[PDB]
Symmetry: C5
Subunit: 346 residues, 5 copies
Amino acid sequence: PMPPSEFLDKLMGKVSGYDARIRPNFKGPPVNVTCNIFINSFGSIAETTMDYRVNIFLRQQWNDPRLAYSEYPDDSLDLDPSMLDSIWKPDLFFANEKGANFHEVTTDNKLLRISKNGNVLYSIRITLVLACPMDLKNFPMDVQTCIMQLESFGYTMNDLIFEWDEKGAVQVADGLTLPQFILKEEKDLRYCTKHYNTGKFTCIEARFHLERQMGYYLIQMYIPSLLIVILSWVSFWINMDAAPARVGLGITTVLTMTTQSSGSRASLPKVSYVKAIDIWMAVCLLFVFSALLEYAAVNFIARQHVEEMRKLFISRAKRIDTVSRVAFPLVFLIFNIFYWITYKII
Amino acid sequence: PMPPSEFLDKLMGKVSGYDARIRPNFKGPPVNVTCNIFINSFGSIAETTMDYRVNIFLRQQWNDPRLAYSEYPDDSLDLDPSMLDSIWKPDLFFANEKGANFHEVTTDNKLLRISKNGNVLYSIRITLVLACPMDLKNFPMDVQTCIMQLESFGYTMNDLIFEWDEKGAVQVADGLTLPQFILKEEKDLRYCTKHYNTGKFTCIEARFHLERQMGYYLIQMYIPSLLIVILSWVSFWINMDAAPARVGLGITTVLTMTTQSSGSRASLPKVSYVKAIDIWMAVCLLFVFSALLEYAAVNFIARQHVEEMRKLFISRAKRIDTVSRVAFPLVFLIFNIFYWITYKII
Amino acid sequence: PMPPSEFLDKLMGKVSGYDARIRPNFKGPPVNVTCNIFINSFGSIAETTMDYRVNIFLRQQWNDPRLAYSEYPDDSLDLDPSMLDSIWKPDLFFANEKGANFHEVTTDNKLLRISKNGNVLYSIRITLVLACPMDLKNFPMDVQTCIMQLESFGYTMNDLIFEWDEKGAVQVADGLTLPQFILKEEKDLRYCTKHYNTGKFTCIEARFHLERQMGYYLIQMYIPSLLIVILSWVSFWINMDAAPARVGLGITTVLTMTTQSSGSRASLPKVSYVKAIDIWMAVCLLFVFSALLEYAAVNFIARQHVEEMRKLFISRAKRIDTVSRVAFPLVFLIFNIFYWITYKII
Amino acid sequence: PMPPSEFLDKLMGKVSGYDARIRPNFKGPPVNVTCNIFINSFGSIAETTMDYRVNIFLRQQWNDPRLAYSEYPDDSLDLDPSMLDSIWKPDLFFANEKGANFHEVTTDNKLLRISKNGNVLYSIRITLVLACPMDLKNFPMDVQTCIMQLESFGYTMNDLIFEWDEKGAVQVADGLTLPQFILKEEKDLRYCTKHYNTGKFTCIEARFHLERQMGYYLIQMYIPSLLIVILSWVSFWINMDAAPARVGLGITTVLTMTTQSSGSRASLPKVSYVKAIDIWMAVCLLFVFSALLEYAAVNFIARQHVEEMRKLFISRAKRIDTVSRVAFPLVFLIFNIFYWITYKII
Amino acid sequence: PMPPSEFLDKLMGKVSGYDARIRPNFKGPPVNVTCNIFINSFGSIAETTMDYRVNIFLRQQWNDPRLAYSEYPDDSLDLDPSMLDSIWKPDLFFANEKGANFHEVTTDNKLLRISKNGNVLYSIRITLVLACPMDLKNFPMDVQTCIMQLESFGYTMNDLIFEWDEKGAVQVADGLTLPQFILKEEKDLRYCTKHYNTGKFTCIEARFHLERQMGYYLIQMYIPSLLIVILSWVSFWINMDAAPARVGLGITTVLTMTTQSSGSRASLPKVSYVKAIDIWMAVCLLFVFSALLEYAAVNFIARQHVEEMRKLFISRAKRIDTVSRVAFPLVFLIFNIFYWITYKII
Ligand SMILES: *[C@@H]1O[C@H](CO)[C@@H](O[C@@H]2O[C@H](CO)[C@@H](O[C@@H]3O[C@H](CO)[C@@H](O)[C@H](O)[C@@H]3O)[C@H](O)[C@H]2NC(C)=O)[C@H](O)[C@H]1NC(C)=O
Ligand SMILES: *[C@@H]1O[C@H](CO)[C@@H](O[C@@H]2O[C@H](CO)[C@@H](O[C@@H]3O[C@H](CO)[C@@H](O)[C@H](O)[C@@H]3O)[C@H](O)[C@H]2NC(C)=O)[C@H](O)[C@H]1NC(C)=O
Ligand SMILES: *[C@@H]1O[C@H](CO)[C@@H](O[C@@H]2O[C@H](CO)[C@@H](O[C@@H]3O[C@H](CO)[C@@H](O)[C@H](O)[C@@H]3O)[C@H](O)[C@H]2NC(C)=O)[C@H](O)[C@H]1NC(C)=O
Ligand SMILES: *[C@@H]1O[C@H](CO)[C@@H](O[C@@H]2O[C@H](CO)[C@@H](O[C@@H]3O[C@H](CO)[C@@H](O)[C@H](O)[C@@H]3O)[C@H](O)[C@H]2NC(C)=O)[C@H](O)[C@H]1NC(C)=O
Ligand SMILES: *[C@@H]1O[C@H](CO)[C@@H](O[C@@H]2O[C@H](CO)[C@@H](O[C@@H]3O[C@H](CO)[C@@H](O)[C@H](O)[C@@H]3O)[C@H](O)[C@H]2NC(C)=O)[C@H](O)[C@H]1NC(C)=O
């Protein structure tokens, strides 16, 4: 008979004494607000700024005994967001917001429905730019753990407690992909209960493990680093005497190893510790220059050393030549097997 | 006699029991809202961010039996956007908004008119920055399909259903051009009906097929890649003996093929898979270096090998020379015919 | 006696039946709104985005017979923008807004005055980022025509018509200069009457012809392109025999012509058609490389060809030398006279 | 007894006939509003956009005889910004705003106090991004004059006149420094009275003279330009015969003079006229290349010219050598003394 | 019995004469507002703009005798931010805001509670982009002191005084790290009492000492500067005669020392004074070029100077050779010990 919006105006109005400024179960046990999120979008994970943009559906559920109706014949009463400032809502916020906003296009993207016993479902759409610190000690082979944490601002622990629901506390959209990362499915859920000089305030947090796409940096960097070192060694398969081709093929490995070192730290923050993209690349710099010294070991013999005199001349340089030819794959592949299985277990 | 705005205030006011918080056909069949868009602007299609900005006219049509007037002698009653928060409107939103806004310059750019039988036309101007994932496996020769999807936020499927109208569900402005793409005319129109733990919500979506302008990358990249490979082969039409001109014309092809590899991946995301602009260009790198080995095959003879001794010296190198001269167009044009007709059928 | 604001409250209030939701001359002839703009600022003309920012004073004039007073002894009644939502105003908008805003610093920058016969002057300050497509077939020598168009949003042609006034429909500020362009004084004024499936809507538009400053690109690009070609020819005034100076002065023209080709397409969109800054510059690339082939024509004689044998050696190369010396200004100045007078008539 | 806010509500309310929509001295002499600013922050002076951000305290003073109280025992009544829309205020705006905003953090940063005779002090905090054209004919040695101008928007000259007060019309904060400029203390104060087709409107303006920091560009550019020219001359102190060291030290001056010409016009607008950073640098380009021709004048003798024949060979080249050695400081220091004292008097 | 929000409406309403426009202790002693902040986020410390973004909790405490309740049985009455414009609050602002905003997601992030004796606690969440001047005379080894200062805007010193509380006037979040800096724990707290021509206004300020991470610039710059100088000296361990290897290893040190000088001043402002990253690097430029002159001192002997003639030829050059070999670590390590212990005490 009577429509729900007319029914609900006398359920929360000045009649029946409902005050939206007062929490449920006032002067009693605290309010148990259970939460779960639905990640629509994810990404633009900046590393200069060390933050990431997410677009979620924040669903909040609690019980309000003041809103419990008994005689109206429906099981749920929805409430459009025009009258949304008229009941009590929890003062949730994010402890690492770094700017956020609602979505208000064609309607405020907000949802509210009330069960018969007073169970309240509240769902809004938020875009967050959440801050997470980035550990980059092993940069292309790292697992970034960026978190988000949900706190009360005004109510202390003895008035309002946040929880995650057991039925899927973080849902992720179906085809949610990232251009540079993989979002793992194990999502840690734990408390971050804050203590200030004002009081103690509730917190729950979710932890997202992000693992990179190694395939990009392997193409741009690790393959043009690997081939120049092989270019460095075919350069020694030049003739035995000091040819000017060793001058050009020497700087050929120099002009590439500096160019690959030019755009190497392109989009990276200025961290003090050393990462892993350069301890690969600094080794690729000294294996360039070890071929530049290898021409000097030709010129070490060529200006130092007639049937007797010329025989020691070639015999000493070949004694360096076949040793230097074998030892360059020796010093490389021992390093190259020490490099990857280090990061395979880290 | 009586003006429409005075007539409409008693048609939707507190008299006659109209409540804007309640959908039409309440406790009955769901509301059938039919939609079509008019794309004014399009583009700024970012690929680092994988989104695109669009500027549309969102037209929504439904029937409200509460608004059906009978005695007023006009066929349509317009309603200025000052009184627009006074009737019911659908809570449409975009599932991939990534930020959006209205246009409010000199007047809120909004339109509302009401037919005699209660048919309501509602038209607004929106600017969207819609997210679309970018498949870039064959980057200059790809067909990007970027979509837009229109959902209800608060009403489930048993209360509100979106549809596309048959009479031109997507209109495009007349001279709408893109700097980098071609918008095809076949626009797929289908449903994306969402299931959450809240309920099931209606969705309709439109699919835009975008095909690139290959003419830009052919000028900056494919022509300076093609000529250096031809520069690499006239470099072998140098004299037969080991001249220093082969040192300079060797690095001449090196200084260009790295410079063309420098600004190659300029404005591109860091995708893990390999695209097609570099498997053209990596082949253009090894055909540079195959001429650098071709001087080494001159120096392979020059320091290894008197009427008998000099005759085998020139005869072996010419046996390599005329083979290497013919085989370089052989290995190129077989690749070059394998490259394009692969992407002609993809 | 009675102040104007007290007089005007009974002229447009609930007394005397004035309704701001209803256009003048309702159920009669359409409203003739005449417009003119005053461009304060102009520029930041982007070409990657193909838009430009303008800052105007939009003056609108129409007649409202409901506002015609007769007994008050003043000729014009101004109205401060606090009461500006109380009379009727046209719903003008720009069909290519791409974002715009008002100016509200220290007061809403808005102006309204009402004549005795009901003539209404309405003037506001708007900042627009107007979209214009950029034709760049001849890029440093182009004339860009970027437009702006003013439409009604809610009223059709039978209710509201926009016009330009004859008395200076576009005024420009006094010292309005642009860093890269010249705004011509001939400004085309014409109609762009839109037909949608909703109805037909009025439009008037203004066309601004923008002509570039050729002096910038002549300094950075055309002078360092011209001198290297002259550097390419003094390089042939080296000694007759194959000297190593031709190796260095060969790549001297190469290291500049690629560097000038590096920052050439610096701030340009990725258009598919070829512009004019590169068909100058591609010709400046092959006149670099024609001197690199000119050393090969020295080495074509030096390894192919004793009083008889040496006389044909110098006689053939000088036969190429004096021909190549004259023909390089021949092939250049014919092109250079064909280049500019092409664009002098376009 | 009675508090000021209760006293002031009957001083400006509906009682006593005060109307905030009506200027003081209505139908009388115009309102004399005197102004002065306090510059808190200054800078981020962009040159691509040709604007600058400033953060001021705009103090406005006028007399309102309607607000003159006589019996309340205090000399000044302050007014908090909640009731600030209740009295008359001038409609000041900036004719070159290019976007501006108020500051509203923890309170609207606004100030109002009223003297006994009706003198009103009004002070607000504004952040402006003011447009100024940039003359850059002598770019590191220029004096930029960027202005700001304060106008009425709705009141003509016969109703409202702006003035600067004699007691320090522009105050500057104490430690206000700029990273690239020096703000001179002579600040010109004059009128810019505007004439439109609407009427004539008041304007006062202030002129700020900005002089650059020459010390930055002297370090990055003028010292690495000076030393390469000295590197160009010690390069001639090589041995007399045509050595290959002149090839390397020739391009040594080329690889630097183009690199210093690469990042020279880094953050500069595309002005058509020639500035002064390049007419220094273009001269530094041809003094590089004059040493490249100086090796050609060695090779002019080396392939043109036995006790008689060799004596003219060395005697002609030394006749060029000692002349070219002295003349290079001759042509440089005459230019270098002509360069700076030109800009010392401009 | 009676709820607090109903109790508080009669405590601050129109009954009991409370006026939020009037400060506590009016016409009496000034208001003593004590402050402390809690820094949540810190950083994005720009140096081109010379500012930094901070995210704080601003806690303000004062006493209001008008709000002192006696009969209600609770010790603290909280107040939700809906009724927050209903009591008096101090008009705090930041004298170097450069733009700031509140946080309003899911609730206005604001907190208010009132003790029994009228002590008021007020806590809000602010994001500031605070301006600080950057002294960069010794750039990688500097200690930046960036401040923040809290002032009243409308109340003078005889009405409102700010103080820092003794109990931890600046708290910092637990794991607050910076990518480039270290926030020291000694935080200076002092007054910055402002004198304008309006009056004198209260100020308190906090000073944050920021010390850089030297480890980043030591890896990218100081190690590739150190090794090239050692590369410059092994280059002299080439053979004694003038070899072409000294040409290539000469420019090898040139191509790196300019490349390291290319991206050196990458993200730096254009300060006029000289910093310390280049007086390290300019010395690393002339120790590159001192090896280029060292080949000229070989060619000084090679073209100037038969059993007697050749003995003085080698004896003079070895007299330069062993002196130049020892003196290069002599001139370097004296500088290198003078460089660091200068900045160790500064
Ligand atoms: C919100 O959730 C919390 C946590 O589940 C609830 O707190 C817990 O409530 C139970 C039942 O009210 C308490 O058990 C009782 O404890 C007292 C004292 O030990 C004992 O005398 C009773 O026999 C009974 O065992 C429990 O102590 C309490 N725990 C805490 C930490 O507060 C809370 O009641 C929930 N509130 C609502 C409104 O649902
Ligand atoms: C909005 O559009 C939907 C889809 O066209 C309408 O739903 C359909 O409405 C028709 C007629 O009301 C239903 O047909 C009837 O079905 C019942 C049960 O099968 C049968 O007893 C009747 O004889 C008749 O055939 C149809 O089932 C129904 N389909 C669905 C999926 O709901 C809806 O009525 C429209 N609402 C409005 C307000 O226009
Ligand atoms: C706004 O401007 C338009 C265009 O000037 C006006 O429309 C024109 O108005 C005139 C006079 O009212 C019309 O002339 C009349 O035409 C009828 C039918 O042909 C004829 O019987 C009369 O003897 C007279 O010639 C003219 O047709 C009409 N044109 C159009 C295209 O509408 C309009 O009246 C102006 N409205 C106002 C409020 O000023
Ligand atoms: C605001 O400031 C302006 C400029 O100081 C004032 O205008 C000037 O006011 C004086 C005195 O009212 C005028 O002098 C009188 O001029 C008339 C006509 O010439 C003469 O008959 C009188 O004997 C006396 O000399 C003066 O002309 C006038 N000048 C202008 C350009 O308007 C104005 O009165 C000030 N208004 C207020 C409210 O303070
Ligand atoms: C806010 O804090 C300030 C600073 O602590 C207080 O000002 C100081 O208040 C004391 C006590 O009211 C004053 O001491 C008195 O001074 C007078 C004159 O010298 C003397 O006759 C009395 O015997 C007594 O010693 C003190 O002068 C005053 N100082 C200043 C600089 O104002 C203020 O009272 C505090 N206000 C509130 C509301 O708490």
